[PDB]
Amino acid sequence: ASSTPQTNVDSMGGGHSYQFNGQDLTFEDLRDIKDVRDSGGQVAQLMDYKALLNFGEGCEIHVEGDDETKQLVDGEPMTLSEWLEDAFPHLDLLVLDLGGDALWYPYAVGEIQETITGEFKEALPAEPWTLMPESDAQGKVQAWHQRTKTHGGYQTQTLPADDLWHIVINKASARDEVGISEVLRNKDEIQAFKQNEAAINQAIELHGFPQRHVKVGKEDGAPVRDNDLRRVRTIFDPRTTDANTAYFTGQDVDVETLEAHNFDYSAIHEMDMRNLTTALGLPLEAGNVGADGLGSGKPAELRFALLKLAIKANQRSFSVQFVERVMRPVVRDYSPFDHEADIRLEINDPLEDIGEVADLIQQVGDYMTNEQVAEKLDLPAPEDDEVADSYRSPADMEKDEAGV
Amino acid sequence: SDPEYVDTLFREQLLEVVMEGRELRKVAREASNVINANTRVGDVPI
Amino acid sequence: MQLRRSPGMRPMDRDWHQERARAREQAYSSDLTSQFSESEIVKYELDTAQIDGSDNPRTYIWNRTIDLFGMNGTDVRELRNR
Numbered sequence: 001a002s003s004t005p006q007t008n009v010d011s012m013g014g015g016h017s018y019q020f021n022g023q024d025l026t027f028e029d030l031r032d033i034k035d036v037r038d039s040g041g042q043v044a045q046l047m048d049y050k051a052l053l054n055f056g057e058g059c060e061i062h063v064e065g066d067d068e069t070k071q072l073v074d075g076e077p078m079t080l081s082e083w084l085e086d087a088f089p090h091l092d093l094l095v096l097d098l099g100g101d102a103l104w105y106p107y108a109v110g111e112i113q114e115t116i117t118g119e120f121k122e123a124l125p126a127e128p129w130t131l132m133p134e135s136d137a138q139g140k141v142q143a144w145h146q147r148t149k150t151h152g153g154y155q156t157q158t159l160p161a162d163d164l165w166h167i168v169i170n171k172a173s174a175r176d177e178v179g180i181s182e183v184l185r186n187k188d189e190i191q192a193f194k195q196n197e198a199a200i201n202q203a204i205e206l207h208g209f210p211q212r213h214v215k216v217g218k219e220d221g222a223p224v225r226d227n228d229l230r231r232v233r234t235i236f237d238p239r240t241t242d243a244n245t246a247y248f249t250g251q252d253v254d255v256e257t258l259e260a261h262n263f264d265y266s267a268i269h270e271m272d273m274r275n276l277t278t279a280l281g282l283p284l285e286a287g288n289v290g291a292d293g294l295g296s297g298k299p300a301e302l303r304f305a306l307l308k309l310a311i312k313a314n315q316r317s318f319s320v321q322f323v324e325r326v327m328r329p330v331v332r333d334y335s336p337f338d339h340e341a342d343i344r345l346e347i348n349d350p351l352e353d354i355g356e357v358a359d360l361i362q363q364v365g366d367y368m369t370n371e372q373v374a375e376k377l378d379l380p381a382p383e384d385d386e387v388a389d390s391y392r393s394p395a396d397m398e399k400d401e402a403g404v
Numbered sequence: 405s406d407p408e409y410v411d412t413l414f415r416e417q418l419l420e421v422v423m424e425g426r427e428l429r430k431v432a433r434e435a436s437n438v439i440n441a442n443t444r445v446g447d448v449p450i
Numbered sequence: 451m452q453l454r455r456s457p458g459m460r461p462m463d464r465d466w467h468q469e470r471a472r473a474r475e476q477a478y479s480s481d482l483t484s485q486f487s488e489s490e491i492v493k494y495e496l497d498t499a500q501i502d503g504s505d506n507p508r509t510y511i512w513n514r515t516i517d518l519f520g521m522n523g524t525d526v527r528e529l530r531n532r
C-alpha cells in the first residue's frame with residue numbers, strides 16, 4: 001500500500017469567504033454560539049444537561065499492565081496510573097469543561113503548560129469562541145488563528161499547531177479535524193423554539209386574561225366623545241376597582257367583557273419542546289415534558305437505550321482524543337515512563353443503578369474475580385493480590401481462614 | 405419591567421451599542437496636592 | 451428632564467429603531483404622507499429614515515395574475531446572478 005493518504009478531502013476555500021482561514025465558519029459564528037450558551041433560559045439549560053449526561057459522572061484512568069510500570073519517580077515508587085492521577089488531579093472538572101465545550105463548539109482546544117522549573121503544570125483549556133484552525137489540503141490543522149476583546153478593542157494573533165491540542169466530538173466525517181457546532185447545525189430549530197415561546201408568552205398576555213369593555217351611550221342615540229369617556233374611565237378604572245365594587249347605572253351604560261379566548265398553549269409548548277429536544281438529541285423528559293405511552297415498557301427501554309448509546313459514542317470519541325493528544329504528549333515529555341503504554345480513560349455511565357449492579361453481583365458473583373466485583377461496584381480492588389484474583393468472596397476467604 | 409420587543413438568538417437582534425462623545429483629560433488629583441477637608445471652609449497657615 | 455418622546459431621547463428608544471425598521475420594510479415610496487399617520491411620521495421621525503421602498507421585500511417578489519410555472523413568490527434578489 002502507501003505511507004500517505006491518496007484519496008483527497010473536501011477542503012478549505014474558507015466556505016467562499018475571502019482571505020481564507022477556518023473551514024466554513026468565522027469568529028462571528030463562534031460568538032453566535034457563545035451567545036446561545038451565555039443567554040440562559042430553556043435552550044441553554046438543555047445543552048448544559050447534555051454536557052452533564054456525557055461528562056458529569058467523572059472518569060477513571062486505566063493502564064493495561066500498570067503493575068509492570070513500577071518505577072522510582074523521585075526516590076518514591078509509582079505506576080504510570082499513579083503518576084497520571086498526580087499529573088491530572090482535577091480531571092473530573094477538566095473532562096466536564098472540555099467535553100461540554102466540544103458539544104457546544106466544533107472543538108475543545110488548549111495548551112500544555114510547565115512550571116517555572118520546566119515540569120508539567122496543567123493542560124490549560126482556551127476560550128473556544130476566540131480560536132479557529134487553519135488546515136492544509138490533507139485536512140489536518142497546521143495553525144490556529146485567535147482574536148480576543150481588550151480595553152483597546154480586538155487583539156489578533158496566530159499560533160502553530162505544535163503546542164496547542166484540540167478535541168472534536170462532532171465530526172462531519174472520520175477524516176474531519178475541524179468538526180461541527182451542534183448549535184450552528186440546529187440554528188433554525190433553536191430560533192423556531194424561541195419564536196414560538198415568544199408567541200405563546202405574548203398570546204397569554206393578550207388572550208389568557210379577560211378584559212373589561214365599557215360601552216357608553218344608547219345604540220343609534222347621542223354620541224359620546226373622548227373627554228366624555230375620560231369621566232366614565234375614572235369610574236370603572238381597574239386601578240381603583242376592588243373585588244366587591246358594585247356599579248349603579250342608567251340603562252345606556254354596558255359593562256361588556258372580552259372573555260379569555262381559549263387556546264391550547266400547553267400543547268404548543270409540548271410540541272416546541274419535542275422539536276427542540278429531538279433536534280438536540282435529548283429525551284423529551286429532560287425538558288420537563290412527559291409524553292403519554294412512552295413512559296413505560298419497551299418504548300422506555302428503547303429511548304433510554306438510544307440515550308446511553310449516544311453517550312457512549314461521545315465518551316469514547318472524547319476519551320481516545322484526550323489520551324492520544326493530551327496524555328501521551330505529557331507522558332512523553334515530562335514522565336520517566338513509556339509514552340507508548342496502553343493508557344485508557346473511561347468516563348462513567350451517568351445512568352448506572354448500583355442497586356441493579358448489586359443484584360447482578362448476587363446472581364453471578366460466583367463467576368467474577370474479587371477485582372472484577374470491586375470494579376463493577378466502583379471500589380478499590382483488594383490490597384492482597386491472591387484474594388483480588390480469586391473468585392469467592394474476601395469475607396468467605398476470611399471466615400474460612402478463621403477455621404484454620 | 406415589561407419590554408415591548410423580545411431579543412432573538414444568534415445575534416440576529418437589533419444593533420445594540422452607543423458611540424461615545426468627546427472625553428476631556430482629567431489630571432488635577434495627580435497634578436496638585438489634594439486636601440480631603442473636614443470642613444467646607446477652612447485655612448492653610450503660611 | 452427627559453421623556454421617551456423628547457427629541458434628544460429618541461435614539462435610545464428600542465421602539466424608535468424597531469418602528470423605523472418596520473416603516474422601511476412596509477413602504478413602497480419616499481411619499482410618507484400617503485403611507486403613514488401624521489402621528490407615526492412625527493413619533494418615529496420618518497422624514498429622516500431612508501424610506502424609499504428599496505427595503506420592502508414585495509418590491510422584488512413576483513406576483514403575476516396567472517401562475518402556470520410556480521413563478522409567484524420568487525424573490526429576484528435571491529437568484530444566482532444577484
Ligand SMILES: [Mg+2]
Pocket residue numbers: 221222223
Ligand atoms: Mg344627535
Ligand SMILES: [Mg+2]
Pocket residue numbers: 445446447
Ligand atoms: Mg477662615
